[PDB]
């Protein structure tokens, strides 16, 4: 026989089920939206409808999102939105030949940045395209403030963004101790990506890490029923005091 709800949302089904369904609504939104980033190799077409080349017919055409072949190690640093491409190719790029499976891997470089928001130097692998992205953002802190985490497409940079957001919404003196003037200047500079203190709770963590924050959050030593019955008897005594 047949299963009632569809398995195409079975995972999504569990997203509304139980203890994990007690997660923050902001976390639900951040795991719920699926906005797409600009591509690494899928150059965008012009507009909605355009004339056919060999037919001269006004046809609406879209562009294919090429899947980003992300090796695991590139998550350990702040790479760009680029990577490798696991596909195939023809010998002379000619479809009338016997094609073979092929790969397009990136050329990374181990560089370093020194964030004032972090107020520390982090050295990791990045891309020259990622270098250009940071330069166009003019600073790593502003870049962390700028792109979406879905646009980030990297775990380490997402973690760095989470830390930067926590520091910005915290405004603790430990960010710039014995230099509150520089702290205030940076806070004015970093006033753009201000977030609520509650927003730092599930900031950029894994879905498994979201379950982790839940179990670290929803758990507590259970209330004593000696204490509970004592409180109930106190309530009964207060009520009978009016009797």
């Amino acid at each position: 026989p047949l299963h009632k709800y569809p398995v195409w949302l079975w995972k999504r089904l569990q997203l509304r089920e139980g203890i994990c369904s007690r997660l923050p609504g902001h976390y639900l939104r951040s795991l719920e939206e699926e906005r797409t980033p600009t591509p690494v190799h899928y150059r965008p077409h012009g507009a909605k409808f355009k004339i056919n080349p060999k037919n001269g017919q006004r046809e609406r055409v879209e562009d294919v999102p090429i899947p980003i072949y992300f090796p695991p190690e590139s998550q350990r640093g702040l790479w760009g939105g680029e990577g490798w491409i696991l596909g195939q190719i023809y010998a002379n790029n000619d479809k009338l030949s016997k094609r073979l499976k092929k790969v397009w891997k990136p050329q990374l470089f181990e560089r370093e940045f020194y964030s004032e928001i972090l107020d520390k130097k982090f050295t990791v692998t990045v891309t020259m395209r990622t270098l250009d992205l940071i330069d166009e953002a003019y600073g790593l802190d502003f870049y962390i403030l700028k792109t979406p985490k879905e646009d980030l497409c990297s775990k380490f940079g997402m973690d760095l963004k989470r830390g930067m957001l926590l520091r910005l919404a915290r405004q603790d003196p430990q960010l710039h101790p014995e230099d509150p003037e520089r702290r205030a200047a940076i806070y004015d500079k970093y006033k753009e990506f201000a977030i609520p203190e509650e927003e730092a709770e599930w900031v950029g963590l894994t879905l498994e890490e979201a379950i982790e924050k839940q179990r670290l959050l929803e758990e507590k030593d259970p209330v004593p029923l000696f204490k509970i019955y004592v409180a109930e008897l106190i309530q009964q005594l207060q009520q009978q005091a009016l009797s």
């Binding site: 004593p224 029923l225 000696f226 204490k227 019955y229 004592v230 109930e232 008897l233 106190i234 005594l237």
Partner: protein, 117 residues
Amino acid sequence: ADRMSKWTSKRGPRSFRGRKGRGAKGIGFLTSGWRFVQIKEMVPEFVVPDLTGFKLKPYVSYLAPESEETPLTAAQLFSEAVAPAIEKDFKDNLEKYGFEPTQEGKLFQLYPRNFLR
């Protein structure tokens, strides 16, 4: 080439027999010379009281009446136990009522349990 039996004592070679055992609880420790020393500390200790003069016989006579199955409800027992102390104290800080912060110092703690059966 036989598998459907249980894994009790008799399976294979000498030491292969040696490790596992039936459902005992261990009592001692293994030290030099392959000599086991079993402390009186870790042993079972079954100290039953004296049975003389208890008038409750092992079976109960059928001439007695029947009652209602009153399960030991936690709120009911708690009320029955704490009613007089709270009634006097409110007419008069739960340490006077005996609320236990932790059972770390008691012989028979509950969470975890250290009593037996």
